[PDB]
Design a protein around this ligand. Structure first.
Ligand code: SAH
Ligand code: 8GC
Length: 252
């Protein structure tokens, strides 16, 4: 199973963005964006602080979220990935072009702003960029942070967790960052055992709906929403059966 080490040496953040975020990849990103819209815009989910866990080099998962949460902390294990994110934050020439994705979100949200203004609201929202390891009982390190109103994690936990016990423990580690009554939002692959960035292979925990749901409940959360798309990534990308999106509340 892919080690943390392999992420630092061999996960190329720009290639990942080229592979997935420029087909099945399109159809899945469309669906994830519509779920995020639903969760952050239509549903309750609101607050002062959202912490995004395993952000990678991506910002798509934060586009509707910056409308509901004053402040966003982005986090990942790989500093190389956070640096790729930071290129976008700082509006650098070589930064990835999220404009097609941003426009789609603006569309979903009733065209009340244009892309530029939406991007400026996300850049304004992101307050800290920090290191994170979900396998650590203190995932963000030795210094305390304020407790979050929401924890967001997209396509991270299956890749971070080599087995079911570690998966449960990661949910409890992350819970320590969340205030009681805080929301846990997870989107991840279903029954996937690997994914690809070009020729480089990464492991995935092949988890099913029942296993995900039982694990989230055991870790001390209620499930408010669980939704499945049974769309696999392209044949050279992953062997997932589909993707899930769950919303949970930490117990009070
Ligand atoms: N132990 C760990 N703790 C936190 N993040 C980890 C981790 N192991 C791997 N990761 C990170 O998990 C991410 C998976 S790629 C997911 C990126 C993004 N959230 C998206 O939705 O596309 C990578 O950025 C990788 O560095
Ligand atoms: C980061 N990522 C992207 C696509 C699929 C997977 C997976 N866990 O199968 C992970």
């Amino acid at each position: 199973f892919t080690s943390k080490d392999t992420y630092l040496r061999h996960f190329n953040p720009r290639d990942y963005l080229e592979k997935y975020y420029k087909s099945a990849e399109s159809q899945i990103l469309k669906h994830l964006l519509e779920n995020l819209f639903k969760i952050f815009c239509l549903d309750g989910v609101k607050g002062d602080l959202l912490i995004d866990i395993g952000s990678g080099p991506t910002i798509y998962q934060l586009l509707s979220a910056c409308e509901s949460f004053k402040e966003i902390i982005v986090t990942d294990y790989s500093d190389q990935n956070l640096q790729e994110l930071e290129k976008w934050l700082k509006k650098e020439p070589e930064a990835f072009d999220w404009s097609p994705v941003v426009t789609y979100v603006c569309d979903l949200e009733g065209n009340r702003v244009k892309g530029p203004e939406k991007e400026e609201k996300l850049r304004q929202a992101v307050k800290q960029v920090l290191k994170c390891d979900v396998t650590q009982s203190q995932p963000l390190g030795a210094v305390p942070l304020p407790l979050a109103d929401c924890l967001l994690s997209t396509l991270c936990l299956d890749a971070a967790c080599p087995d079911l016990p570690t998966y449960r423990r990661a949910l409890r580690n992350l819970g320590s960052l969340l205030k009681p009554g805080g929301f846990l939002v997870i989107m991840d692959a279903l029954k996937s055992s690997y994914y690809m960035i070009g020729e480089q292979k990464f492991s995935s925990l092949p988890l099913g709906r029942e296993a995900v749901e039982a694990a989230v409940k055991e870790a001390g959360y209620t499930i408010e929403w669980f939704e499945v798309i049974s769309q696999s990534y392209s044949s050279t990308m992953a062997n997932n059966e589909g993707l899930f999106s769950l919303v949970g509340r930490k117990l009070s």
